[PDB]
Every structure is written in C-alpha cells, then in structure tokens.
Design a protein around this ligand. Sequence first.
Ligand SMILES: Cc1cc2nc3c(=O)[nH]c(=O)nc-3n(C[C@H](O)[C@H](O)[C@H](O)COP(=O)(O)O)c2cc1C
Ligand SMILES: C[As](C)(=O)[O-]
Ligand SMILES: [Zn+2]
Length: 118
Amino acid sequence: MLVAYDSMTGNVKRFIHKLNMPAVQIGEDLVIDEDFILITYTTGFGNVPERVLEFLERNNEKLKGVSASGNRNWGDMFGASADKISAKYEVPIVSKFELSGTNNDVEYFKERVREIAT
Ligand SMILES: Cc1cc2nc3c(=O)[nH]c(=O)nc-3n(C[C@H](O)[C@H](O)[C@H](O)COP(=O)(O)O)c2cc1C
Ligand SMILES: C[As](C)(=O)[O-]
Ligand SMILES: [Zn+2]
C-alpha cells in the first residue's frame, strides 16, 4: 500500500523511512493514481499543513486512511490534523504518534494499514 507523506522538520520523514513501505513525498503537482494512506504532521492548534490540504483537495478520492504525527503537549489538539481529515473525507484514522514515532508506532501503523488494504 502506497504511503503519501509530508514533513517540514523531518519527523514524519524519519517515520516513513522506518516503515520500508512504498512512499512518496507530496507536492503540488502530484497526482496519485492508486489507493494511498496519508501521513501528515500537525500544525498549530490542531491543524493540517497547507501543502497537505492542497494535495488532498486534488487527491482525496484515493485516500484510504490518515495517520498524524504530533505532540501530546498539545493536549486534545494532539494529532488533530488526522481528526479533521478523517471527518471531512470519511476515512479512518490509522494511528497517531508523537514526533518521529517509536518502534511500536511503526509496527502498529503497518498492521492497521494491512487491515485497510484488505
Ligand atoms: C508551531 C508548532 C505547532 C504545533 N502544533 C501541534 C498541534 O496542534 N498538535 C500536535 O499534535 N502537534 C503539534 N505540533 C507538533 C508537530 O506536529 C510535530 O513536531 C511533528 O512531528 C512535526 O513533523 P515534521 O517534523 O515532519 O514537520 C506543533 C509543532 C510546532 C513547531
Ligand atoms: C521520499 As523519499 C525518496 O526520501 O523515500
Ligand atoms: Zn529517503
């Protein structure tokens, strides 16, 4: 299953290298041709990065799930980028993790995506 991601300061990028899954960095040109899972980070006050918003405006029909990187010091806005995307596009939240994730977060993501890919 293809993973589309974005990363400003490298934490999500670190996570997706731990996955060893097919992965593509999103861009404004990018048109994805197959089902994919998004991994986004979370911007101030529970928000979705603009580059991700722009990409999803164009690519949401192939979106099958979303995970967010965030930080629990944001309390109930932790990972709320995923809550927004999930609600808007009616796709599951695969997972939430902090920063570049733990090994357990990596494993958990892959297990959940295997389920959704069925
Ligand atoms: C200014 C700023 C605001 C943030 N806002 C939130 C937030 O509302 N919720 C959250 O869970 N994480 C928040 N984060 C944490 C980032 O989402 C987290 O560091 C993430 O791992 C960054 O991913 P990246 O390194 O791939 O850009 C914020 C970080 C910064 C610098
Ligand atoms: C987005 As890449 C080439 O570092 O896997
Ligand atoms: Zn790389």
